[PDB]
DNA sequence: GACTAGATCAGAAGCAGTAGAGCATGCATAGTTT
């Protein structure tokens, strides 16, 4: 049971459920040289904690740091498992060049498929960035949804249907908010379901929803005449039926 | 809401795998 | 003061010590642990040869030679190290408190007599000479035994016996919900009951602030570099001792270790013949020096004998007015000369008379100084130094002589000739205003060596495996912002009055 | 003997270095 | 829900852009 | 007598401080070659 053959390892792990002595004894009984400090001959240093020594090693680009999990997996399978950015904390320039070929800059590969857990691991490394703006992200999402026959999602079923609600007594006035009970929550649900709700009636509006107040129908019918594109007036049964059936209903039956 | 995230993950997986398969095919062609 | 200082940290493990009055506050137990850790680090940096111990009382388990109940000696008297600090670190937090409770326990009874007996037994075990014996009591219970009076009497008797033995007792009383009162029980146990330490204290003791103040500077006990003879003439001789009140501080010497197992290695130097390969001791080889296109060969013994002038000691030559001495003739750090009556009886009287008369007449004793054998003599001046005390009568300047070295003709270097340009009175006045604006009071201990402090911080971080080293604030860096704010416009006026319009000092 | 260093018996306590403090 | 969806889609677009860059580089190399 | 255990002296080890030499590093200064 000697998988290893004349290989030098340095261990500096601190706070861990598998302290240093057990790993050192295991390495010794696995035919593996153990050293207390790194050197030109050692080909890996293991440390499960971000102490000062690992930071110093990181700042000196001459060695590779590997998490303890790599050696545990090696023990489990009784075979030499190839390294991976998953089992790594830092890479020397040679390992950076090697992994830059078949492993992308993040922790993903383009030669082997991936599963849910692997993709979650890749996403964990990625950090939030704010180089985007709402409208452009929405447009890019729409293009992505259109590209790969990707319009079949139930929660993105209103991506391309912007809806304007008649919850304001005076159009284009934010100070005339009403106290609609059903209308307000219905608009909130529409927004939550992927639809786009705009408080200001602009040229980008596509659909219009009017509650049980029919007095405003004439105003909307007059406004749509000047608009280059005419929107459609629909009743509340349309949205409820669409949500219940999980699929869009024809507006002809609800115009 | 809970099922949304798993749907999105399974959704991204297939397209990423398709792109990786395209990379594999291109590398196989380049093997010549 | 000869020997080592031994200290024992008695920490109460009662329930009342683990309760925090406020959510955002440190429990007494955590404060005691922090104080112990700080003292450990300070001792490691300053006096690594001292002995420390840590003992707990009021616990469920026990560990002691006498096998008493509810007394767990966590660490016996031993030199401090990183291992003990790391061991104590596992009780710092709340999880540390749970670990401590699981390991030993809390809420049990106890007797102070047994605690003092265990402390005395620990003191007796040490084989080294102990100049100081000290115990510190970290507790917040002014009435440890209120129900029983026999236990209190036994504790009082044991404390008195320890005091007679020569063991100092200190009480680092901690915060109490009601208020600590020393007058109840601890007036007798404590070695010294200060007059001010009789009121009810509503806050932790002020000594904890001193304990938490880390000292990262080495402490050296008094020692005499040499014990020489002052010879007024061939037949009048007195005995004096030389000390170095100022000495440069250097980093501890590095040690060579093996890479594989960190095992210390030994370094050996040898000299061998090129044409023969044999090993030559440092007596076969000769010495050479090429002067006048010729080689001069001298043996090692002769080379050493070249430096023999006179026997070690100080030889009197005369007395010189202090005015002739020059401040800019500094050559070497000065030394301190004090009487030494052990070698010669009557030295102190003559030394005192000489000091008094030198102070009266404002003169310095010119002498020829030879510290060790086979060392060329030097010319030194002994300047009288009177005894100066501060407000609290603590001596700040000892009485004796200040030995200052005097340069030879070879120690001076010629200077390039430079024409003298005198500034006008207005420029001198503006510079005087600037100087007055930038005035401050100077003290000899107002600065610290950044290199040594950073080295100590890095060493501690490496030993204790801390996340990041502690950064030391440098007090020697000029305060540019404060100086700019204070000076105001004076700099501009001075520059306009002293520099042409186009000068560009930087270029 | 006020001012004695608790940590190191027999040595006078040293105040923390204050650097430069302008009047 | 909106925050979760936007975050996931941003991560996915970044990863897909990296994959497409790799594909383009491989195609350019194969052009030789 | 013998053993065991206390107390006394003298030499060796540790440590501090000094001096000498070498190395390396950096920088400046002046002479020689093209």
From Swiss-Prot, chain A:
Residues 1-88, 153-255 form the BRCT domain. It is found in: Nucleus. Belongs to the ATP-dependent DNA ligase family. It comes from the Eukaryota. DNA ligase involved in DNA non-homologous end joining (NHEJ); required for double-strand break (DSB) repair and V(D)J recombination. Catalyzes the NHEJ ligation step of the broken DNA during DSB repair by resealing the DNA breaks after the gap filling is completed. Joins single-strand breaks in a double-stranded polydeoxynucleotide in an ATP-dependent reaction. LIG4 is mechanistically flexible: it can ligate nicks as well as compatible DNA overhangs alone, while in the presence of XRCC4, it can ligate ends with 2-nucleotides (nt) microhomology and 1-nt gaps. It comes from Homo sapiens (Human). The gene is LIG4. It is linked to LIG4 syndrome: Characterized by immunodeficiency and developmental and growth delay. Patients display unusual facial features, microcephaly, growth and/or developmental delay, pancytopenia, and various skin abnormalities. This is DNA ligase 4. Testis, thymus, prostate and heart.
Curated annotation (Swiss-Prot), chains B, E:
Residues 12-32 are annotated as: Interaction with LIG4. The chain holds residues 169 to 200 of 336 of the full protein. This is DNA repair protein XRCC4. It is found in: Nucleus; Chromosome. It comes from Homo sapiens. Belongs to the XRCC4-XLF family. XRCC4 subfamily. Changing residue 24 to A: Abolished DNA-binding. The gene is XRCC4. Phosphorylations by PRKDC at the C-terminus of XRCC4 and NHEJ1/XLF are highly redundant and regulate ability of the XRCC4-NHEJ1/XLF subcomplex to bridge DNA. Phosphorylation by PRKDC does not prevent interaction with NHEJ1/XLF but disrupts ability to bridge DNA and promotes detachment from DNA. Monoubiquitinated. Changing residue 25 to D: In XRCC4-Asp mutant; phospho-mimetic mutant; abolished ability to bridge DNA. It is linked to Short stature, microcephaly, and endocrine dysfunction: A disease characterized by short stature and microcephaly apparent at birth, progressive postnatal growth failure, and endocrine dysfunction. In affected adults endocrine features include hypergonadotropic hypogonadism, multinodular goiter, and diabetes mellitus. Variable features observed in some patients are progressive ataxia, and lymphopenia or borderline leukopenia. It comes from the Eukaryota. The modification Phosphoserine is found at residue 25. Widely expressed.
Swiss-Prot record, chain C:
Its main location: nucleus. Residues 230-437 form the Ku domain. The modification Phosphothreonine is found at residue 424. The keyword Chaperone does not apply. There is a cross-link at residues 256, 286 (Glycyl lysine isopeptide (Lys-Gly) (interchain with G-Cter in SUMO2)). Residues 342-451 are annotated as: Interaction with XRCC5. The keyword Membrane does not apply. It is found in: Nucleus; Chromosome; Cytoplasm. The modification Phosphoserine is found at residues 20, 275, 446, 489. Changing residue 133 to A: Abolishes adduct formation. Changing residue 129 to A: Abolishes adduct formation. The modification N6-acetyllysine is found at residues 286, 300, 307, 430. Its EC number is 3.6.4.-, 4.2.99.-. Single-stranded DNA-dependent ATP-dependent helicase that plays a key role in DNA non-homologous end joining (NHEJ) by recruiting DNA-PK to DNA. Required for double-strand break repair and V(D)J recombination. Also has a role in chromosome translocation. Has a role in chromosome translocation. The DNA helicase II complex binds preferentially to fork-like ends of double-stranded DNA in a cell cycle-dependent manner. It works in the 3'-5' direction. Belongs to the ku70 family. Individuals with systemic lupus erythematosus (SLE) and related disorders produce extremely large amounts of autoantibodies to XRCC5 and XRCC6. Existence of a major autoantigenic epitope or epitopes on the C-terminal 190 amino acids of XRCC6 containing the leucine repeat. The majority of autoantibodies to XRCC6 in most sera from patients with SLE seem to be reactive with this region. This is X-ray repair cross-complementing protein 6. It comes from Homo sapiens. The lineage of its organism: Eukaryota, Metazoa, Chordata, Craniata, Vertebrata. The gene is XRCC6. The chain holds residues 32 to 538 of 609 of the full protein.
Curated annotation (Swiss-Prot), chain D:
It comes from the Eukaryota. Residues 1-23 are annotated as: Mediates interaction with XRCC5/Ku80 and XRCC6/Ku70 and association with the non-homologous end joining core complex. The chain holds residues 180 to 202 of 204 of the full protein. Homodimer. Interacts with the DNA-bound XRCC5/Ku80 and XRCC6/Ku70 heterodimer (Ku complex); the interaction is direct. Associated component of the non-homologous end joining (NHEJ) complex, composed of the core proteins PRKDC, LIG4, XRCC4, XRCC6/Ku70, XRCC5/Ku86 and NHEJ1/XLF. Interacts with POLL (DNA polymerase lambda); promoting POLL recruitment to double-strand breaks (DSBs) and stimulation of the end-filling activity of POLL. It is found in: Nucleus; Chromosome; Cytoplasm. Phosphorylation may inhibit interaction with the DNA-bound XRCC5/Ku80 and XRCC6/Ku70 heterodimer (Ku complex). Belongs to the XRCC4-XLF family. PAXX subfamily. The N-terminus (residues 1-113) forms a head domain that is structurally related to those of XRCC4, XLF/NHEJ1, and SASS6. This is Protein PAXX. A motif (XLM) lies at residues 11-23. The lineage of its organism: Eukaryota, Metazoa, Chordata, Craniata, Vertebrata.
């Amino acid at each position: 049971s000697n998988i290893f053959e004349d290989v030098e390892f340095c261990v500096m792990s601190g706070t861990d459920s598998q302290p240093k002595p057990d790993l050192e004894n295991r390495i010794a009984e696995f035919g593996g040289y153990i050293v207390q400090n790194p050197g030109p001959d050692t080909y890996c240093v293991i440390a499960g904690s971000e102490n000062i020594r690992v930071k110093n090693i990181i700042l000196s680009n001459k060695h590779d740091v590997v998490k303890p999990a790599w050696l545990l997996e090696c023990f489990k399978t009784k075979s030499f498992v190839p390294w991976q950015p998953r089992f790594m904390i830092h890479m020397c320039p040679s390992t950076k060049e090697h992994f830059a070929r078949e492993y992308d800059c993040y922790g993903d590969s383009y030669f082997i498929d991936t599963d849910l857990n692997q993709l979650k691991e890749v996403f964990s490394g990625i950090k939030n960035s704010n180089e985007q703006t709402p409208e452009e992200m929405a447009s890019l999402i729409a293009d992505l949804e259109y590209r790969y026959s990707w319009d079949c999602s139930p929660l993105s079923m209103f991506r391309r249907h912007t809806v304007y609600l008649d919850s304001y007594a005076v159009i284009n006035d934010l100070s005339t908010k009403n106290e609609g009970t059903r209308l307000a929550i219905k608009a909130l649900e529409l927004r939550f379901h992927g639809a786009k709700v705009v408080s200001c009636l602009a040229e980008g509006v596509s659909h219009v929803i009017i509650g049980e107040d029919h007095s405003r129908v004439a105003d909307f019918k007059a406004f749509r005449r000047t608009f280059k594109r005419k929107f459609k007036i629909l009743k509340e049964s349309w949205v409820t039926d669409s949500i219940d059936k999980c699929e869009l209903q024809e507006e002809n039956q609800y115009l | 809401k809970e099922a949304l995230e798993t749907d999105l993950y399974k959704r991204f997986i297939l397209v990423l795998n398709e792109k990786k398969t395209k990379i594999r095919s291109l590398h196989n062609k380049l093997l010549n | 003061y000869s020997g080592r200082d031994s200290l024992i940290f008695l920490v109460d493990a009662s329930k009342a010590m683990f309760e925090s009055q406020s959510e955002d506050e440190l429990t007494p137990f955590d404060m005691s642990i922090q104080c112990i850790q700080s003292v450990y680090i300070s001792k490691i940096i300053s006096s690594d040869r001292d002995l420390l111990a840590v003992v707990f009382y009021g616990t469920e388990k026990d560990k002691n030679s006498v096998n008493f109940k509810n007394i767990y000696v966590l660490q016996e008297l031993d030199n401090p190290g990183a291992k003990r600090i790391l061991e104590l670190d596992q009780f710092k937090g709340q999880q540390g408190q749970k670990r401590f409770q699981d390991m030993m326990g809390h809420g049990s009874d106890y007797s102070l007599s047994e605690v003092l007996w265990v402390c005395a037994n620990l003191f007796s075990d040490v084989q080294f000479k102990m100049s100081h014996k000290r115990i510190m009591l970290f507790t917040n219970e002014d009435n440890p035994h209120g129900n029983d009076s026999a236990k209190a009497s036994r504790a009082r008797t044991k404390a008195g016996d320890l005091r007679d033995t020569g063991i100092f007792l200190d009480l680092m009383h901690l915060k109490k919900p009601g208020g600590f009162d020393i007058s109840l029980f601890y007036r007798d146990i404590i070695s010294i009951a200060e007059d001010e330490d009789l009121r009810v204290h509503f806050e932790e003791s002020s000594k904890l602030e001193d304990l938490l103040r880390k000292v990262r500077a080495k402490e050296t006990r008094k020692r005499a570099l040499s014990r020489l003879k002052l010879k007024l003439n061939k037949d009048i001789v007195i005995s004096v001792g030389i000390y170095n009140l100022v000495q440069k501080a250097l980093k501890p010497p590095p040690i060579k270790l093996y890479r594989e197992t960190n095992e210390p290695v030994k370094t050996k130097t040898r000299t061998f013949n090129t044409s023969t390969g044999g090993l030559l001791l440092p007596s076969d080889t000769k010495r050479s020096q090429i002067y006048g296109s010729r080689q001069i060969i001298l043996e090692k013994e002769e080379t050493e004998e070249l430096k023999r002038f006179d026997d070690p000691g100080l030889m009197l030559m005369g007395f010189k007015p202090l005015v002739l001495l020059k401040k800019h003739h500094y050559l070497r750090p000065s030394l301190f000369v004090y009487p030494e009556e052990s070698l010669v009886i009557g030295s102190s009287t003559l030394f005192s008379a000489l000091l008094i008369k030198c102070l009266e007449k404002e003169v310095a004793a010119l002498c020829r100084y030879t510290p060790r054998r086979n060392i060329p003599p030097y010319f030194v001046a002994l300047v009288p130094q009177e005894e100066e005390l501060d407000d609290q009568k603590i001596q700040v300047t000892p009485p004796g002589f200040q030995l200052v070295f005097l340069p030879f003709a070879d120690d001076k270097r010629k200077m390039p000739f430079t024409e003298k340009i005198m500034a006008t009175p207005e420029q001198v006045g503006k510079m005087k205003a600037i100087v007055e604006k930038l005035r401050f009071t100077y003290r000899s201990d107002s600065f610290e060596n950044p290199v040594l402090q950073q080295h100590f911080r890095n060493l501690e971080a490496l030993a204790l495996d801390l996340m990041e080293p502690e950064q030391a604030v440098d007090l020697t860096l000029p305060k540019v912002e404060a100086m700019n704010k204070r000076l105001g416009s004076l700099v501009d006026e001075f520059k306009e009055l002293v520099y042409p319009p186009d000068y560009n000092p930087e270029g | 003997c006020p001012g004695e260093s608790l940590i190191n018996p027999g040595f006078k306590s040293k105040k923390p270095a204050g650097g430069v403090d302008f009047d």
